[PDB]
Amino acid sequence: HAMMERGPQTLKETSFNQAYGRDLMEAQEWCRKYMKSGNVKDLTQAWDLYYHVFRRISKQLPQLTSLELQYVSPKLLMCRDLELAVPGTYDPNQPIIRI
Amino acid sequence: AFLDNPTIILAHIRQSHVTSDDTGMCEMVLIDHDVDLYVYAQSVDITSSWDFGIRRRSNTAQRLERLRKERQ
Amino acid sequence: NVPLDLTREPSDNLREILQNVARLQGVSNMRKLGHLNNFTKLLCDIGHSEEKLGFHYEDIIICLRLALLNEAKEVRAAGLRALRYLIQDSSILQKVLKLKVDYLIARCIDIQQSNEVERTQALRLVRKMITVNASLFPSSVTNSLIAVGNDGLQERDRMVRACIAIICELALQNPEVVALRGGLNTILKNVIDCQLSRINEALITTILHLLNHPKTRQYVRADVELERILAPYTDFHYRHSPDTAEGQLKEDREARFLASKMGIIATFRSWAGIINLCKPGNSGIQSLIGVLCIPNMEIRRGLLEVLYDIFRLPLPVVTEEFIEALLSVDPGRFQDSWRLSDGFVAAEAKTILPHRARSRPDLMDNYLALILSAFIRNGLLEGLVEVITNSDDHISVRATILLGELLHMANTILPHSHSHHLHCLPTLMNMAASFDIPKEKRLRASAALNCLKRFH
Amino acid sequence: ACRLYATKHLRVLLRANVEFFNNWGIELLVTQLHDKNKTISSEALDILDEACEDKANLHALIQMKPALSHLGDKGLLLLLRFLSIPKGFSYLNERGYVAKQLEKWHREYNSKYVDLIEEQLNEALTTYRKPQRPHVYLPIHLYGQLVHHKTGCHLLEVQNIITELCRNVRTPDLDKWEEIKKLKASLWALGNIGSSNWGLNLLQEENVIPDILKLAKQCEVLSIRGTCVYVLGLIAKTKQGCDILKCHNWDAVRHSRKHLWPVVPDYIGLALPVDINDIFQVKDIPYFQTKSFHLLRQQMSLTEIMNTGLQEHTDDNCLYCVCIEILGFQPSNQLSMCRILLRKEVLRLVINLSSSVSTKCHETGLLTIKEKYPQTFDDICLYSEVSHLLSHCTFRLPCRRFIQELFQDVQFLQMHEEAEAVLA
Secondary structure: OOOHHHOOOOHHHHHHHHHHHHHHHHHHHHHHHHHHOOOHHHHHHHHHHHHHHHHHHHOOHHHOOOOOHHHHOOOHHHOOOOOOEOOOOOOOOOOOOEO | OOOOOHHHHHHHHHHHHHHOOOOOHHHHHOOOOOOOOOOOOOOOOOOOOOOOOOOOOOOOHHHHHHHHHHHO | OOOOOOOOHHHHHHHHHHHHHHHHOOOOHHHHHHHHHHHHHHHHHOOOOHHHHOOOHHHHHHHHHHHHOOOOHHHHHHHHHHHHHHOOOHHHHHHHHHOOOHHHHHHHHOOOOOOOOOHHHHHHHHHHHHHHHOOOOOHHHHHHHHHHHHOOOOOOOOOHHHHHHHHHHHHOOOHHHHHHOOOHHHHHHOOOOOOOHHHHHHHHHHHHHHOOOHHHHOOOOOOOOHHHOOHHHHOOOOOOOOOOOOOOOHHHHHHHHHHHHHHHHHHOOOHHHHHHHOOOOOOHHHHHHHHOOOOOOOOHHHHHHHHHHHOOOOOOOOOOOHHHHHHHOOOOOOOHHHOHHHHOOHHHHHHHOOOOOOOOOOHHHHHHHHHHHHHHHOOHHHHHHHHHHOOOHHHHHHHHHHHHHHHHHHHHHOOHHHOOOHHHOHHHHHHHOOOOOOHHHHHHHHHHHHHHHHHO | OHHHHHHHOOHHHHHOOOOOHHHHHHHHHHHHOOOOOHHHHHHHHHHHHHHOOOHHHHHHHHOOOOOOOOOOHHHHHHHHHHHHOHHHHHHHHOOOHHHHHHHHHHHHHHHHHHHHHHHHHHHHHOOOOOOOOOOOOOOOOHHHHHHHHOOHHHHHHOOOHHHHHHHHHHOOOOOOHHHHHHHHHHHHHHHHHOOOHHHHHHHHOOOOHHHHHHHHHHOOOHHHHHHHHHHHHHOOOOHHHHHHHHOOOEEOOOOOOOOOOOOOOOOOOOOEEOOHHHHHOOOOOOOHHHOOOHHHHOOOOHHHHOOOOOOOOOOOOOOOOOHHHHOOOOOOOOOOOOOHHHHHHHHHHHHHHHHOOOHHHHHHHHHHHHHHOHHHHHOHHHHHHHHHHHOOOOOOHHHHHHHHHOOOOOOOHHHHHHHHHHHO
């Protein structure tokens, strides 16, 4: 909840928010309502909400097969050069190979 | 591009639901007697009832019946 | 089954109702149907007022509600017939509802045991009570109706559409309860699962109206409710329902796409939709255009339909060659009604020769100019050029035709200042003369420009 | 059929610009105005109205003056288009036709104009059908036609109609629908009356154009937002009005429709803000959502624990305890202690069933408690509370009608016999 409230930053996260955010926020409302007044009647709703979200999400995980960078995170494909060496391959005695 | 006052919205809803439904059930419920602002003999509404009865089971029961006999 | 109608109404109804309750014993159910029908007749023909009625209303309603406990369904139906005739002033209904008859009507709503003549009476009783006073509507009935309207479609109940009709009708008077029990999301999800035109647009008009009044605007959240409807395009894998049959999946996708497309073209008609969907923030309309420039082969052929029938353009036939698609949408194309038998001349003369007005306003062009400017602001042409360049031919022809038609509309209804720099076509022309890019883009852009000229 | 085909066969005779149509086409039209079919009369009215946008045609119409008052409001507005020229305005004045119309416009028909125009628009673009692109034109309104000949200015100001609409627009209510309605009607009237060079003079004194600009970019109601753009595009029909608007950063079209390729070195009503998002400012509003036993479940199970009666039961919220005051019912009876623990067990179970995380197992648990003690389900206090929870929980449909039908066949002797006792 803390991380989602800073706002989606790319199209994929934006679409996820567009689909699920109402549920994900109102479940939080119910859980805060519970921790205010201890009564399982409140958290029953929040758990039902969360579990409905789980059933919805779990139906599509297997189909996930490929990712297009321009949809997933836009900053990466706009590098075209950098200063970093290829991670993990770097020795003190050989000139570096930049990504 | 002007649908603001409730009157036109209600009329649009009622006409759309009565005309375009596959089963008449909804429009059987969508009668406009309800008045608002002649409830004469039943707004010539007139029916009664009409049948043949007694009592079958429930959706469950078989459930309850079958489990009760197996558990006995 | 005892018609007298000429006696003391107090004694008449008193003995009638006493024999009707019958200590719940020693009286048949069909003769109870009789007694109820005679009761309904007596309220129909006799003016109802306590002084000449000789009784309070409390004993009357208490006597009526006991008819809802017996096994006979038609007894409950007749009880409903009576109860609707009791509700006459707000005082009456509030005395009735302080008595916990709401829970009884609630049981009656949700049974669905092959009894389709009773709940209809219950629903029309609910419409009567909301008409007379929805400001005192109970919550239990609200919860029952939302429950049937949420997951009634999977169990093939034939009263879900009537139910959503009821909830929309009630939404106008008391959005507090509907929001607290969370109905508006239920309604919204229900706009995606209805392929019929008129019902869909009527439904969406409800929430569109709800975005006007400040009181109404306080009831609805910021960025989760309305822009939901454009879900199946902004998502690559949208799963609307948890429990679905595996035997059909794609047909689900076509149904979902048709529903969402019609909802989208519905919401761009009302002012509330237009203003809300184009806020200076990261509104959904920016998201739609941003999606347009991802290489997904069917999505880019999902959006173009929406664009055409937003602008009320004639679609071209799908084809790999430009010049055929050009003729396919010529305004001088033959029309079936123009044959001898049908409309021989006058109808065709309506289309081909131009109108005689020289100074009349024609607001329709005004609306189209507004929408066009709205799209121009958010860099629509950039995505159009992107699709024209990097895609398949089946889609390139469609995008090129759209671009040409929009440009022709531009210098026709658009004021000069907003139309003096668009027609320069910066991005396409710039790519057209780059000598370092791969040659495919260059030549296809050249051909695109040729097609645009011939179109004009 | 021959009626209709011949009569609508005159659009080609009009739209193709035939030689001297006014000589005979108009007389034939007026003769056909009298025919039997209402539909054919209506279409003849339509074609004649389409024709009368040519001044020579209207003059050759005013050579012979028929009676249109026997037809509907369509003929009414058609006759109201006569007011464009004093040559004919003088003829119409003789029987006081002006004051007999103008008052009835001010009182009743001005409100009808907005209704009929939104009717036309909804039929055009909303698929309404009150019981491919259309062409929507503004119906002819009196206040617009009077301002045409520079003397209707006096004939109008005799009532000082300006002041009521203008102090209406300065101080609108914007609460419910009739304020909105008459406010829209006033807006449309203003847009119409601003449509001449002369009318501009009689409207510029109040300096209300800034008021309309204020409304178009700082108001509340979005329908009024659209109407503001419409009326402001309306007042942009004349060059002087366009000069007025350009001072406030609003573009407009400066050419007519006569040639579809106009060179920039009487127009069509049109106005746009220079930066379109300017009118898209909306003030946001905060959302209105601003405002024991289950721990025993660890060691204490059904088998060993079995060998007010409710937690959440009060004198209210009981289907029997509520009637006790109003009808003097008997106090609730106390029967057989072994049941109360069962009562709270079943209510805890159904509350757990509210989560619906594993509905079937809890379903089986209540079913077992049911058939083991089938007669326990007669208590009313439990029944009222489960009804209350169904009024205050979120249940999937199967569990909901399940829990409802689990109390299907019950008797409740106590209420019924007490009630038939207290009845008489």
